[PDB]
């Protein structure tokens, strides 16, 4: 039922991401967050994270930093709601950090410093909200992946950015 | 030849400065690549120089150095200007340069470097202006259209509006 509503949102969200329609991407992800927030079930959040993951992936490979920010903002909102309502939110936290990882690697290889900063920032805030050893572990690996890709490509700014985020995740723990 | 190895030694210095962000050493090396091609006078030296330019611009873009990307784009224009004066059939040089400006603009747009995308569009226009052939105009419009569709997917209204103005001037200055 609400699975059908999200699947209709997924079609419109992905299509706007392929063409670069940042306004439609923003409103579809907003609708997807509302469907999961009204349902309140764990499956509704995971289905909404799947739409977020695919949109953020296309937006990152297209270089649309705005659509990346909106996707990762909704992904963070889903983690926030899951940490208050879902009994075992560790699966939702895994899905969100995986979506952040793909954005981070795509931006790091292309050299999109701004998209790297956002992905590293979101990984930092997801680890702070969850506060679990698994969330910190996955967040640091996202930072480690960006650092390795950036050092190989000689992107000093992305290396320095991953430097600061790694320390801030450590101090949060 | 020996010039193929002299250009490769210049590309090594130009790539290192592109990784480091030393935009002044990138420009100096690319000028030496232009001078090595100028003293040769053969179209194969100009083609190898364009490949040095293309390879340097991509490394600089992935390294997060937009100024080294823009200086590399400007050298590709000077290579066309030098090839127009010497080579009998510079159509192969112009085609390789316009496709090099295209691939660099695509990497620049996917990296969020809006200004490097603007410079690439301005270089495509000047290449069509200098080449003066109807083939080069068609190929320059194809580069601007490709960059426009890439910028549209990147959600960059600035580059789309800039490609719209460039595409108009290329049609007029023909």
Numbering used by the authors:
A (entry chain B): 3 to 175
B (entry chain A): 2 to 175
Text lifted from the article:
We set out to design proteins that can switch between two well-defined and fully structured conformations. We reasoned that these goals could be collectively achieved with a “hinge”-like design in which two rigid domains move relative to each other while remaining individually folded. The hinge amplifies small local structural and chemical changes to achieve large global changes while the chemical environment for most residues remains similar throughout the conformational change, avoiding the need for global unfolding. Designing one of the resulting conformations to bind to a target effector couples the conformational equilibrium with target binding.
The backbone conformation of the DHR serves as the first conformational state of our hinge protein (“state X”). We solved crystal structures for two designs, cs207 and cs074. For design cs207, crystals were obtained from two separate crystallization screens: one screen for the hinge alone, and one screen for the hinge in complex with the target peptide. In the absence of peptide the experimental structure agrees well with the state X design model, and the structure of the hinge-peptide complex agrees well with the state Y design model. The crystal structures of hinge cs207 in both designed states demonstrate the accuracy with which two very different conformational states of the same protein can now be designed.
